[PDB]
Amino acid sequence: GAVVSTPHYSPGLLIEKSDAYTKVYSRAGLTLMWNREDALMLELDTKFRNHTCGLCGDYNGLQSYSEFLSDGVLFSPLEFGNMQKINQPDVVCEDPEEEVAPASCSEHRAECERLLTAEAFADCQDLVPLEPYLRACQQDRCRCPGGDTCVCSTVAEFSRQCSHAGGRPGNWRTATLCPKTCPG
Amino acid sequence: CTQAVCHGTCSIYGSGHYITFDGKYYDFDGHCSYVAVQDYCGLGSFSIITENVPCGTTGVTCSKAIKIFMGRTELKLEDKHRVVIQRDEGHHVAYTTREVGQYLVVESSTGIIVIWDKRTTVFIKLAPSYKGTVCGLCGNFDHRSNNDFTTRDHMVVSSELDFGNSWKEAPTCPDVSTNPE
Ligand SMILES: *[C@@H]1O[C@H](CO)[C@@H](O[C@@H]2O[C@H](CO)[C@@H](O)[C@H](O)[C@H]2NC(C)=O)[C@H](O)[C@H]1NC(C)=O
Ligand SMILES: *[C@@H]1O[C@H](CO)[C@@H](O)[C@H](O)[C@H]1NC(C)=O
Numbered sequence A: 001g002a003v004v005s006t007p008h009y010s011p012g013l014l015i016e017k018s019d020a021y022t023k024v025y026s027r028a029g030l031t032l033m034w035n036r037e038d039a040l041m042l043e044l045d046t047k048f049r050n051h052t053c054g055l056c057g058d059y060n061g062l063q064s065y066s067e068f069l070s071d072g073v074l075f076s077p078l079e080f081g082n083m084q085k086i087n088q089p090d091v092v093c094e095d096p097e098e099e100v101a102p103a104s105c106s107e108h109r110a111e112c113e114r115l116l117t118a119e120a121f122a123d124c125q126d127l128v129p130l131e132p133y134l135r136a137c138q139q140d141r142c143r144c145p146g147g148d149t150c151v152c153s154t155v156a157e158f159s160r161q162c163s164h165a166g167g168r169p170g171n172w173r174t175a176t177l178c179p180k181t182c183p184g
Numbered sequence B: 001c002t003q004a005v006c007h008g009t010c011s012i013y014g015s016g017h018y019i020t021f022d023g024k025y026y027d028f029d030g031h032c033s034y035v036a037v038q039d040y041c042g043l044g045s046f047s048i049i050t051e052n053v054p055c056g057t058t059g060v061t062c063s064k065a066i067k068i069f070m071g072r073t074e075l076k077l078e079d080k081h082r083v084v085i086q087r088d089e090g091h092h093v094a095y096t097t098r099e100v101g102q103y104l105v106v107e108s109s110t111g112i113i114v115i116w117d118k119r120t121t122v123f124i125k126l127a128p129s130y131k132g133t134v135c136g137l138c139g140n141f142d143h144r145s146n147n148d149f150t151t152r153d154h155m156v157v158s159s160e161l162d163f164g165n166s167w168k169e170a171p172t173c174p175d176v177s178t179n180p181e
Protein backbone atom coordinates (compact mmCIF):
# COMPACT_ATOMS: atom_id res chain seq x y z
CA GLY A 1 0.00 0.00 0.00
CA ALA A 2 3.01 2.34 0.15
CA VAL A 3 5.01 3.62 -2.81
CA VAL A 4 8.64 2.45 -2.74
CA SER A 5 11.68 4.33 -3.95
CA THR A 6 13.80 1.95 -5.93
CA PRO A 7 16.19 0.16 -5.19
CA HIS A 8 14.59 -1.40 -2.11
CA TYR A 9 16.75 -3.62 0.07
CA SER A 10 14.62 -5.35 2.75
CA PRO A 11 16.26 -8.63 3.85
CA GLY A 12 14.06 -11.03 1.91
CA LEU A 13 13.15 -8.89 -1.07
CA LEU A 14 15.03 -6.73 -3.57
CA ILE A 15 13.01 -4.43 -5.84
CA GLU A 16 15.07 -2.44 -8.34
CA LYS A 17 14.22 -0.46 -11.46
CA SER A 18 16.51 0.08 -14.44
CA ASP A 19 15.74 2.26 -17.44
CA ALA A 20 14.50 -0.88 -19.23
CA TYR A 21 13.35 -3.51 -16.71
CA THR A 22 11.83 -3.76 -13.23
CA LYS A 23 13.33 -6.65 -11.28
CA VAL A 24 12.05 -8.38 -8.14
CA TYR A 25 14.46 -10.77 -6.40
CA SER A 26 13.10 -12.90 -3.56
CA ARG A 27 14.74 -15.39 -1.21
CA ALA A 28 11.90 -17.87 -1.86
CA GLY A 29 13.42 -18.73 -5.24
CA LEU A 30 11.56 -16.25 -7.39
CA THR A 31 12.82 -13.71 -9.91
CA LEU A 32 10.51 -11.49 -11.95
CA MET A 33 11.66 -9.18 -14.74
CA TRP A 34 9.40 -6.94 -16.81
CA ASN A 35 9.99 -4.18 -19.28
CA ARG A 36 7.10 -1.91 -18.66
CA GLU A 37 5.13 -2.65 -21.84
CA ASP A 38 4.66 -6.30 -22.74
CA ALA A 39 7.43 -8.82 -21.96
CA LEU A 40 7.15 -10.63 -18.64
CA MET A 41 9.37 -13.49 -17.52
CA LEU A 42 9.63 -15.47 -14.29
CA GLU A 43 12.33 -17.77 -12.92
CA LEU A 44 11.81 -20.37 -10.20
CA ASP A 45 14.30 -22.72 -8.60
CA THR A 46 13.97 -26.51 -8.64
CA LYS A 47 12.19 -26.60 -5.26
CA PHE A 48 8.76 -25.89 -6.78
CA ARG A 49 8.63 -28.98 -9.02
CA ASN A 50 5.20 -30.69 -9.28
CA HIS A 51 3.65 -27.74 -7.41
CA THR A 52 3.12 -24.84 -9.83
CA CYS A 53 -0.38 -24.42 -11.22
CA GLY A 54 -0.55 -21.18 -13.21
CA LEU A 55 -0.85 -20.43 -16.90
CA CYS A 56 2.87 -21.27 -17.09
CA GLY A 57 1.92 -24.94 -16.69
CA ASP A 58 3.22 -27.23 -14.02
CA TYR A 59 6.93 -27.66 -13.43
CA ASN A 60 7.42 -31.41 -13.79
CA GLY A 61 9.73 -31.25 -16.81
CA LEU A 62 7.40 -33.12 -19.18
CA GLN A 63 6.67 -31.52 -22.57
CA SER A 64 2.89 -30.89 -22.93
CA TYR A 65 1.97 -33.88 -20.76
CA SER A 66 -0.36 -32.69 -17.99
CA GLU A 67 -1.01 -29.15 -19.23
CA PHE A 68 -3.02 -30.02 -22.35
CA LEU A 69 -3.82 -33.75 -21.95
CA SER A 70 -5.31 -34.15 -18.46
CA ASP A 71 -7.76 -37.08 -18.71
CA GLY A 72 -7.15 -38.08 -22.33
CA VAL A 73 -8.98 -35.03 -23.71
CA LEU A 74 -6.64 -32.61 -25.47
CA PHE A 75 -7.22 -29.02 -24.34
CA SER A 76 -6.81 -26.26 -26.90
CA PRO A 77 -4.68 -23.28 -25.79
CA LEU A 78 -7.78 -21.05 -25.79
CA GLU A 79 -9.63 -23.26 -23.29
CA PHE A 80 -6.46 -23.80 -21.26
CA GLY A 81 -6.23 -20.04 -20.77
CA ASN A 82 -9.87 -19.47 -19.82
CA MET A 83 -9.45 -22.03 -17.04
CA GLN A 84 -6.73 -19.83 -15.50
CA LYS A 85 -8.95 -16.76 -15.05
CA ILE A 86 -9.48 -14.85 -11.78
CA ASN A 87 -12.97 -13.72 -10.79
CA GLN A 88 -13.02 -10.15 -9.55
CA PRO A 89 -16.03 -9.35 -7.36
CA ASP A 90 -17.31 -6.28 -9.19
CA VAL A 91 -16.56 -6.63 -12.92
CA VAL A 92 -17.89 -9.14 -15.45
CA CYS A 93 -15.34 -9.67 -18.23
CA GLU A 94 -16.14 -11.71 -21.33
CA ASP A 95 -13.94 -14.61 -22.38
CA PRO A 96 -12.60 -14.43 -25.95
CA GLU A 97 -14.52 -16.64 -28.35
CA GLU A 98 -13.06 -19.14 -30.80
CA GLU A 99 -12.11 -17.40 -34.02
CA VAL A 100 -12.49 -19.28 -37.29
CA ALA A 101 -9.33 -21.33 -37.96
CA PRO A 102 -7.14 -19.29 -40.33
CA ALA A 103 -4.64 -20.51 -42.89
CA SER A 104 -1.37 -21.83 -41.46
CA CYS A 105 0.89 -18.94 -42.44
CA SER A 106 3.63 -20.95 -44.16
CA GLU A 107 4.20 -18.30 -46.86
CA HIS A 108 6.57 -16.41 -44.52
CA ARG A 109 8.75 -19.25 -43.23
CA ALA A 110 11.59 -18.06 -45.48
CA GLU A 111 11.66 -14.58 -43.93
CA CYS A 112 11.59 -15.76 -40.30
CA GLU A 113 14.33 -18.33 -40.92
CA ARG A 114 16.58 -15.84 -42.73
CA LEU A 115 16.11 -13.17 -40.07
CA LEU A 116 16.39 -15.10 -36.81
CA THR A 117 19.39 -17.28 -37.76
CA ALA A 118 21.66 -14.35 -38.59
CA GLU A 119 25.34 -13.96 -37.74
CA ALA A 120 24.55 -12.14 -34.49
CA PHE A 121 22.94 -15.27 -32.97
CA ALA A 122 25.94 -17.58 -33.43
CA ASP A 123 26.65 -18.94 -29.94
CA CYS A 124 23.02 -19.63 -29.01
CA GLN A 125 21.97 -22.11 -31.72
CA ASP A 126 22.91 -24.92 -29.32
CA LEU A 127 21.45 -23.23 -26.22
CA VAL A 128 17.87 -22.37 -27.24
CA PRO A 129 15.80 -24.12 -29.93
CA LEU A 130 14.67 -22.68 -33.26
CA GLU A 131 11.33 -24.39 -33.90
CA PRO A 132 9.13 -22.75 -31.18
CA TYR A 133 10.35 -19.18 -31.72
CA LEU A 134 10.05 -19.51 -35.50
CA ARG A 135 6.53 -20.90 -35.13
CA ALA A 136 5.66 -17.80 -33.08
CA CYS A 137 7.22 -15.71 -35.86
CA GLN A 138 4.69 -17.15 -38.33
CA GLN A 139 1.60 -15.55 -36.78
CA ASP A 140 3.37 -12.23 -36.12
CA ARG A 141 3.94 -11.70 -39.84
CA CYS A 142 0.40 -12.49 -41.06
CA ARG A 143 -1.58 -11.04 -38.12
CA CYS A 144 0.46 -7.79 -38.01
CA PRO A 145 0.50 -6.33 -41.54
CA GLY A 146 2.23 -3.12 -42.55
CA GLY A 147 4.76 -2.04 -39.94
CA ASP A 148 7.15 -4.50 -38.32
CA THR A 149 6.31 -4.25 -34.63
CA CYS A 150 5.33 -7.89 -34.03
CA VAL A 151 8.30 -9.65 -35.62
CA CYS A 152 10.80 -7.68 -33.50
CA SER A 153 9.23 -8.67 -30.23
CA THR A 154 9.93 -12.36 -30.98
CA VAL A 155 13.54 -11.97 -32.13
CA ALA A 156 13.86 -9.55 -29.22
CA GLU A 157 12.68 -12.48 -27.10
CA PHE A 158 15.08 -14.81 -28.89
CA SER A 159 17.97 -12.52 -27.88
CA ARG A 160 16.73 -12.59 -24.27
CA GLN A 161 16.57 -16.38 -24.15
CA CYS A 162 20.00 -16.33 -25.79
CA SER A 163 21.46 -14.14 -23.03
CA HIS A 164 19.85 -16.03 -20.16
CA ALA A 165 21.36 -19.49 -20.67
CA GLY A 166 24.77 -17.83 -20.76
CA GLY A 167 25.39 -16.90 -24.38
CA ARG A 168 26.13 -13.49 -25.84
CA PRO A 169 24.21 -12.26 -28.90
CA GLY A 170 25.35 -9.56 -31.28
CA ASN A 171 23.71 -6.42 -32.60
CA TRP A 172 20.90 -7.04 -35.10
CA ARG A 173 18.96 -3.75 -34.88
CA THR A 174 19.94 -1.71 -37.92
CA ALA A 175 18.50 1.65 -38.98
CA THR A 176 15.72 -0.11 -40.93
CA LEU A 177 15.18 -3.21 -38.72
CA CYS A 178 13.41 -1.94 -35.56
CA PRO A 179 15.77 0.79 -34.27
CA LYS A 180 15.81 2.10 -30.71
CA THR A 181 16.78 5.58 -29.53
CA CYS A 182 18.47 6.78 -26.34
CA PRO A 183 19.58 10.34 -25.52
CA GLY A 184 23.18 11.51 -25.58
CA CYS B 1 54.16 1.45 28.54
CA THR B 2 55.20 -0.65 25.55
CA GLN B 3 54.62 0.71 22.04
CA ALA B 4 52.83 -1.82 19.86
CA VAL B 5 49.99 -0.89 17.53
CA CYS B 6 46.62 -2.45 18.32
CA HIS B 7 43.72 -3.44 16.07
CA GLY B 8 41.22 -0.70 15.24
CA THR B 9 37.47 -1.00 15.67
CA CYS B 10 34.50 0.57 13.88
CA SER B 11 31.04 0.31 15.45
CA ILE B 12 27.53 0.45 13.97
CA TYR B 13 24.74 0.03 16.50
CA GLY B 14 21.09 0.80 17.20
CA SER B 15 19.09 3.37 15.21
CA GLY B 16 21.96 4.79 13.22
CA HIS B 17 24.89 5.33 15.58
CA TYR B 18 28.53 5.21 14.53
CA ILE B 19 32.02 5.21 16.02
CA THR B 20 34.86 5.49 13.54
CA PHE B 21 38.27 3.77 13.71
CA ASP B 22 39.68 7.02 15.17
CA GLY B 23 36.89 7.39 17.71
CA LYS B 24 34.40 9.92 16.35
CA TYR B 25 30.76 9.50 17.33
CA TYR B 26 27.99 10.65 14.99
CA ASP B 27 24.44 9.88 13.87
CA PHE B 28 23.22 9.19 10.36
CA ASP B 29 19.79 7.81 9.44
CA GLY B 30 20.12 6.84 5.78
CA HIS B 31 17.91 4.48 3.76
CA CYS B 32 20.09 2.85 1.06
CA SER B 33 23.19 0.65 0.95
CA TYR B 34 26.27 2.39 2.36
CA VAL B 35 30.01 1.78 2.22
CA ALA B 36 31.14 0.92 5.74
CA VAL B 37 34.80 0.10 5.03
CA GLN B 38 36.64 -0.41 1.75
CA ASP B 39 40.12 0.06 0.34
CA TYR B 40 38.96 1.05 -3.16
CA CYS B 41 39.74 4.62 -2.13
CA GLY B 42 40.94 6.54 -5.17
CA LEU B 43 43.48 -1.29 -6.68
CA GLY B 44 41.69 -2.49 -3.56
CA SER B 45 41.07 -5.85 -1.95
CA PHE B 46 37.88 -5.74 0.15
CA SER B 47 34.57 -3.97 0.77
CA ILE B 48 31.99 -4.13 3.57
CA ILE B 49 28.49 -2.84 2.83
CA THR B 50 25.66 -2.12 5.28
CA GLU B 51 21.95 -2.19 4.36
CA ASN B 52 19.98 0.30 6.43
CA VAL B 53 16.17 0.10 6.36
CA PRO B 54 13.54 2.08 8.30
CA CYS B 55 12.80 0.47 11.65
CA GLY B 56 9.89 2.47 13.08
CA THR B 57 7.66 5.22 11.73
CA THR B 58 9.70 8.29 12.76
CA GLY B 59 12.24 8.15 9.93
CA VAL B 60 15.20 6.65 11.77
CA THR B 61 16.95 3.69 10.17
CA CYS B 62 18.91 0.74 11.53
CA SER B 63 21.24 -1.81 9.97
CA LYS B 64 19.72 -5.13 8.95
CA ALA B 65 22.23 -6.76 6.57
CA ILE B 66 26.00 -6.90 6.04
CA LYS B 67 27.70 -7.85 2.77
CA ILE B 68 31.38 -8.81 2.93
CA PHE B 69 33.37 -8.74 -0.31
CA MET B 70 36.82 -10.32 0.00
CA GLY B 71 38.50 -10.57 -3.38
CA ARG B 72 35.86 -12.43 -5.36
CA THR B 73 34.21 -14.25 -2.43
CA GLU B 74 30.97 -12.64 -1.24
CA LEU B 75 29.56 -13.47 2.15
CA LYS B 76 26.28 -12.02 3.36
CA LEU B 77 24.99 -11.76 6.92
CA GLU B 78 21.22 -11.89 6.76
CA ASP B 79 18.38 -13.55 8.73
CA LYS B 80 20.55 -14.67 11.69
CA HIS B 81 22.83 -16.71 9.39
CA ARG B 82 25.78 -16.39 7.05
CA VAL B 83 25.36 -17.21 3.35
CA VAL B 84 28.17 -17.95 0.89
CA ILE B 85 27.66 -16.31 -2.51
CA GLN B 86 30.04 -16.70 -5.49
CA ARG B 87 32.91 -18.77 -4.17
CA ASP B 88 35.73 -18.30 -6.68
CA GLU B 89 37.46 -21.11 -8.54
CA GLY B 90 40.87 -21.62 -6.91
CA HIS B 91 41.80 -18.47 -5.03
CA HIS B 92 39.43 -18.78 -1.99
CA VAL B 93 40.84 -16.31 0.58
CA ALA B 94 40.84 -18.27 3.83
CA TYR B 95 38.05 -17.12 6.14
CA THR B 96 36.46 -18.71 9.21
CA THR B 97 32.96 -18.42 10.67
CA ARG B 98 32.18 -19.47 14.24
CA GLU B 99 29.73 -18.49 16.97
CA VAL B 100 31.00 -17.01 20.24
CA GLY B 101 28.30 -16.33 22.80
CA GLN B 102 25.38 -14.49 21.30
CA TYR B 103 27.36 -13.13 18.37
CA LEU B 104 28.55 -14.46 15.03
CA VAL B 105 32.23 -13.92 14.27
CA VAL B 106 33.76 -13.93 10.78
CA GLU B 107 37.56 -13.75 10.60
CA SER B 108 39.87 -13.58 7.58
CA SER B 109 43.49 -14.56 7.06
CA THR B 110 44.19 -11.12 5.59
CA GLY B 111 43.34 -9.34 8.85
CA ILE B 112 39.64 -8.49 8.51
CA ILE B 113 37.30 -9.40 11.39
CA VAL B 114 33.53 -8.82 11.51
CA ILE B 115 31.53 -9.39 14.71
CA TRP B 116 27.74 -9.35 14.51
CA ASP B 117 25.08 -9.78 17.22
CA LYS B 118 22.58 -11.09 14.58
CA ARG B 119 20.29 -8.03 14.83
CA THR B 120 21.74 -4.51 14.36
CA THR B 121 25.14 -4.22 16.07
CA VAL B 122 28.30 -4.78 14.02
CA PHE B 123 31.96 -4.55 15.04
CA ILE B 124 34.59 -4.40 12.29
CA LYS B 125 38.24 -4.92 13.25
CA LEU B 126 41.25 -4.39 11.01
CA ALA B 127 44.84 -5.48 11.55
CA PRO B 128 47.25 -2.52 11.92
CA SER B 129 48.50 -3.02 8.35
CA TYR B 130 45.44 -1.07 7.15
CA LYS B 131 46.56 2.27 8.59
CA GLY B 132 45.54 5.15 6.36
CA THR B 133 44.44 2.86 3.53
CA VAL B 134 40.64 2.65 4.02
CA CYS B 135 37.60 4.90 3.65
CA GLY B 136 33.84 4.82 4.08
CA LEU B 137 31.51 5.69 6.93
CA CYS B 138 34.11 4.32 9.39
CA GLY B 139 36.83 6.81 8.53
CA ASN B 140 40.36 6.17 7.33
CA PHE B 141 42.22 4.77 10.40
CA ASP B 142 45.21 7.12 10.63
CA HIS B 143 45.01 8.08 14.35
CA ARG B 144 43.82 11.62 13.59
CA SER B 145 40.10 12.24 13.82
CA ASN B 146 39.57 15.66 12.24
CA ASN B 147 39.53 14.17 8.74
CA ASP B 148 37.10 11.27 9.21
CA PHE B 149 34.40 13.24 7.39
CA THR B 150 36.09 12.86 4.01
CA THR B 151 33.51 12.34 1.28
CA ARG B 152 33.74 10.02 -1.73
CA ASP B 153 35.26 12.84 -3.82
CA HIS B 154 38.08 13.39 -1.26
CA MET B 155 36.67 16.48 0.46
CA VAL B 156 36.59 17.01 4.22
CA VAL B 157 33.19 18.47 5.11
CA SER B 158 31.82 19.47 8.52
CA SER B 159 28.31 18.04 8.12
CA GLU B 160 27.19 14.57 9.16
CA LEU B 161 24.67 14.62 6.31
CA ASP B 162 26.94 15.67 3.45
CA PHE B 163 29.46 13.00 4.45
CA GLY B 164 26.99 10.17 4.96
CA ASN B 165 24.97 10.94 1.83
CA SER B 166 28.10 10.54 -0.30
CA TRP B 167 28.70 6.89 0.61
CA LYS B 168 25.37 5.58 -0.65
CA GLU B 169 25.66 2.87 -3.28
CA ALA B 170 22.85 3.68 -5.64
CA PRO B 171 22.52 7.12 -7.24
CA THR B 172 18.71 7.01 -7.12
CA CYS B 173 18.63 6.63 -3.33
CA PRO B 174 17.38 9.86 -1.71
CA ASP B 175 19.31 12.32 0.41
CA VAL B 176 18.78 12.62 4.15
CA SER B 177 18.05 16.28 4.79
CA THR B 178 17.59 16.24 8.58
CA ASN B 179 18.02 13.88 11.48
CA PRO B 180 14.76 12.83 13.15
CA GLU B 181 13.95 13.24 16.83
C1 LIG C 1 46.38 -14.40 11.81
O1 LIG C 1 47.26 -13.56 11.06
C2 LIG C 1 48.31 -14.27 10.38
C3 LIG C 1 49.24 -13.24 9.80
O2 LIG C 1 48.79 -12.75 8.55
C4 LIG C 1 47.69 -15.20 9.34
O3 LIG C 1 48.72 -15.95 8.72
C5 LIG C 1 48.62 -15.90 7.28
O4 LIG C 1 47.88 -17.02 6.76
C6 LIG C 1 47.75 -17.05 5.33
C7 LIG C 1 46.93 -18.27 4.98
O5 LIG C 1 46.14 -18.68 6.09
C8 LIG C 1 49.13 -17.06 4.67
O6 LIG C 1 48.98 -16.98 3.26
C9 LIG C 1 49.97 -15.89 5.17
O7 LIG C 1 51.29 -15.97 4.65
C10 LIG C 1 50.03 -15.90 6.70
N1 LIG C 1 50.81 -14.77 7.18
C11 LIG C 1 52.07 -14.89 7.60
C12 LIG C 1 52.72 -13.62 8.07
O8 LIG C 1 52.66 -15.96 7.60
C13 LIG C 1 46.70 -16.14 10.02
O9 LIG C 1 46.02 -16.91 9.03
C14 LIG C 1 45.67 -15.37 10.86
N2 LIG C 1 44.85 -16.29 11.63
C15 LIG C 1 43.77 -16.91 11.14
C16 LIG C 1 43.05 -17.82 12.09
O10 LIG C 1 43.39 -16.74 9.99
C1 LIG D 1 7.37 -35.26 -9.53
O1 LIG D 1 8.59 -35.50 -8.69
C2 LIG D 1 9.79 -34.74 -8.97
C3 LIG D 1 9.76 -33.51 -8.10
O2 LIG D 1 8.97 -33.71 -6.94
C4 LIG D 1 9.91 -34.44 -10.46
O3 LIG D 1 11.29 -34.37 -10.82
C5 LIG D 1 9.22 -35.54 -11.24
O4 LIG D 1 9.51 -35.41 -12.63
C6 LIG D 1 7.71 -35.48 -11.03
N1 LIG D 1 7.08 -36.69 -11.53
C7 LIG D 1 5.82 -36.74 -11.96
C8 LIG D 1 5.34 -38.07 -12.45
O5 LIG D 1 5.09 -35.75 -11.97
Ligand SMILES: [Ca+2]
Pocket: A057, A058, A059, A060, A061, A062, A063, A064, A065, A066, A067
Ligand atom coordinates in the same frame (compact mmCIF):
# COMPACT_ATOMS: atom_id res chain seq x y z
CA1 LIG E 1 4.27 -30.65 -17.98
Ligand SMILES: [Ca+2]
Pocket: B022, B139, B140, B141, B142, B143, B144, B145, B146, B147, B148
Ligand atom coordinates in the same frame (compact mmCIF):
# COMPACT_ATOMS: atom_id res chain seq x y z
CA1 LIG F 1 41.11 9.75 10.53
